[PDB]
Amino acid sequence: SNAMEPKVAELKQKIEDTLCPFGFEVYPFQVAWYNELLPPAFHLPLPGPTLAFLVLSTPAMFDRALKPFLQSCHLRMLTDPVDQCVAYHLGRVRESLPELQIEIIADYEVHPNRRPKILAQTAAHVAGAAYYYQRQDVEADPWGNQRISGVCIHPRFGGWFAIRGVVLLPGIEVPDLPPRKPHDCVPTRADRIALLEGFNFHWRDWTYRDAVTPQERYSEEQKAYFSTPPAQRLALLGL
Numbered sequence: 522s523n524a525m526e527p528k529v530a531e532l533k534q535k536i537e538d539t540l541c542p543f544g545f546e547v548y549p550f551q552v553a554w555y556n557e558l559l560p561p562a563f564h565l566p567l568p569g570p571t572l573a574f575l576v577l578s579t580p581a582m583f584d585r586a587l588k589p590f591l592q593s594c595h596l597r598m599l600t601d602p603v604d605q606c607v608a609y610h611l612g613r614v615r616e617s618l619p620e621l622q623i624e625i626i627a628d629y630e631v632h633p634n635r636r637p638k639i640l641a642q643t644a645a646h647v648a649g650a651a652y653y654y655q656r657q658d659v660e661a662d663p664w665g666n667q668r669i670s671g672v673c674i675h676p677r678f679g680g681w682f683a684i685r686g687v688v689l690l691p692g693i694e695v696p697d698l699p700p701r702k703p704h705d706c707v708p709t710r711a712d713r714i715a716l717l718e719g720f721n722f723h724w725r726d727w728t729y730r731d732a733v734t735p736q737e738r739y740s741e742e743q744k745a746y747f748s749t750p751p752a753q754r755l756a757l758l759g760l
């Protein structure tokens with residue numbers, strides 16, 4: 522951007538230049554699209570037309586962001602390698618746009634009462650990043666008295682991705698940002714059932730992530746990383 526009033530496309534380009542080489546994707550949305558669907562308890566306390574960006578990591582993030590980050594780290598200091606790596610790149614967004622007020626909420630942040638600061642999947646949905654498939658998206662479901670948690674599916678990565686956080690730009694208002702529905706890439710009831718069951722009941726076998734066949738998966742190494750318990754992880758990369 523250069524302008525007296527910065528436009529969404531200029532900002533998106535700048536954030537993408539910063540983040541995309543390192544295996545992230547960014548999707549604009551209005552705060553109102555997020556607040557509309559939510560009770561007052563979960564509302565973001567910003568004007569509705571406030572610009573936000575939903576940020577996710579693709580399979581590439583492991584090799585392009587995390588590995589270089591670990592190599593330049595004092596590994597003894599590190600309690601949360603992935604989170605800190607993502608935090609460093611999110612902080613780089615502030616550096617590329619130093620003139621603008623920016624709030625970042627990461628996916629793992631909670632309020633003192635333990636409620637998530639951002640509902641990542643609702644954000645992913647209204648930003649058109651990934652369709653958020655919920656219990657309500659199955660008519661007359663077979664599941665009875667249990668919690669059926671929802672899951673986002675990306676049209677290119679299927680379930681082989683993660684939502685990393687939201688970048689908010691208070692004072693930049695984009696009331697005419699045109700909304701786009703996420704790709705309904707799991708359209709049939711039978712497939713939504715299999716997807717939700719795979720996510721709620723079988724997530725350790727990975728298979729829910731293939732609910733749409735991906736153009737790219739996590740490598741066998743990245744899979745091994747995330748499925749060995751946190752304490753042994755740096756040993757698995759030989760560090």
Ligand code: B12
Pocket residue numbers: 558559560563628629637638639640641642643646647653655670671672673674680682683684685720721722724
């Ligand atoms: C708490 C949590 C868990 C807990 C408990 C699971 C649970 N969901 O109860 C535990 C620790 C078990 C866990 C682990 C896992 N989960 Co988890 N975790 C979360 C977390 C931090 C909070 C989700 C939450 O509390 N939601 C609260 C409920 C009430 O939200 P909700 O059901 O969406 O309801 C709201 C919406 O429906 C909305 N709404 C109403 N109407 C409408 C209409 C529309 C159209 C929309 C869009 C919304 C909407 O209103 C409701 C609120 O009033 C999120 C990250 C985040 N910050 O959101 C992930 C998250 C859901 N988890 C994730 C994953 C991958 C997992 C694991 C697979 C991790 C792993 N081991 O690899 C496991 C799988 C186990 C499982 N979930 O069944 C990913 C899912 C990515 C995706 N969508 O593909 C998330 C998004 C985090 C991330 N970094 O990506 N998780």
Ligand SMILES: N[C@@H](CCC(=O)N[C@@H](CS)C(=O)NCC(=O)O)C(=O)O
Pocket residue numbers: 600601602603604605680681682683747751
């Ligand atoms: N907090 C630890 C653990 C992070 C972690 O294991 N996160 C998982 C759960 S969201 C993840 O990123 N997995 C990728 C995925 O689920 O696709 C860290 O920062 O390294």
Ligand SMILES: O=S(=O)(O)CCNc1ccccc1
Pocket residue numbers: 607608609611612625626627630
């Ligand atoms: O500083 S707090 O607002 O308390 C926590 C915000 N988390 C965060 C900040 C910068 C980059 C990635 C994540």
Ligand SMILES: C#Cc1ccc(F)cc1F
Pocket residue numbers: 629
């Ligand atoms: C949500 C969530 C979540 C975050 C970090 C982790 F190591 C496991 C999880 F389920």
Ligand code: NA
Pocket residue numbers: none
């Ligand atoms: Na902060």
